[PDB]
């Protein structure tokens, strides 16, 4: 996250950190995700596409730091890794960039609720907040587009949803943004999501609930003028989610 503040998982208790193991001993961060129900975490397909071997990923819930432990955290294995059928990327956009990970602890259990582990709510069918709404994004992604390391402390920031008309302006993203995407930016192009925040949540309040409105997916640069962050429009994928989380 560019700008923003440093926070603790109690402020985003549904945030999931996904890492990949390497033969050799290291573990590297891959993407963020969100807990939808006790056994399911949703993220973005592009985070797994190049290495879809589930046995090599680890998921942690209740984590405020990247490589050090947080007391209360839970470690999980990926029982099922579901990528979207129709996922495609072009020169910028990723279409149908959503993925599901069914998690299982080494003891055979799913997530358990605590002050650091909570689920986030799903929107109702094609129901979104109106443009203008301020939503928050959280993650361990880059703090500057030139950095080559991720922060150790979790960050959060607030961005506003913008209309498709504004985002599809030729000088923003044009037709690359579709109806299954949402754009969000900072009025002053000061704070934004960046590489590493990928797969994580865009949370807004809908009908009184903190709802997972988007998944961090793509953007040109990070915090660049007239280059909003583009998120997967979760409300348009509910049938697909249902199809696997029944």
């Amino acid at each position: 996250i560019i700008g923003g503040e440093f926070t603790t998982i109690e402020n985003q208790p549904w945030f999931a950190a996904i890492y990949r193991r390497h033969r050799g001993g290291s573990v590297t961060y891959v993407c963020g995700g969100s807990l939808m129900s006790p056994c399911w975490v949703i993220s973005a397909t592009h985070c797994f596409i190049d290495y879809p071997k589930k046995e090599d990923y680890i998921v942690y819930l209740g984590r405020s730091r990247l490589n050090s432990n947080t007391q209360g955290e839970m470690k999980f294995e990926v029982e099922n890794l579901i990528l979207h059928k129709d996922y495609s990327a072009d020169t910028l956009a990723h279409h149908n960039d959503i993925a599901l990970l069914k998690i299982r602890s080494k003891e055979g259990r799913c997530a358990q609720p605590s002050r650091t582990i909570q689920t986030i709510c799903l929107p109702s069918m094609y129901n979104d907040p109106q443009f203008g709404t301020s939503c928050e994004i959280t993650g361990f992604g880059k703090e500057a587009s030139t950095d080559y390391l991720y922060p150790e402390q979790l960050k959060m920031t607030v961005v506003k949803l913008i209309s498709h008309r504004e985002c599809q302006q030729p000088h923003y993203y044009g037709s690359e943004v579709t109806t299954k995407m949402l754009c969000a930016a900072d009025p002053q192009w000061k704070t934004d999501s960046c590489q590493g925040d990928s797969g994580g949540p865009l949370v807004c309040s809908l009908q009184g609930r903190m709802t997972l409105t988007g998944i961090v997916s793509w953007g040109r640069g990070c915090a660049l003028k007239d280059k909003p962050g583009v998120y997967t429009r979760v409300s348009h994928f509910l049938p697909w989610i249902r199809s696997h989380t029944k």
Binding site: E10, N11, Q12, P13, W14, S37, P38, P113, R115, Q118, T119, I120, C121, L122, V203, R209, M210, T211
Partner: peptide, 10 residues
């Protein structure tokens, strides 16, 4: 206790 989606507790 049990999950209540969208609720933070601080």
């Amino acid at each position: 206790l049990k999950f209540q989606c969208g609720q933070k507790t601080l």
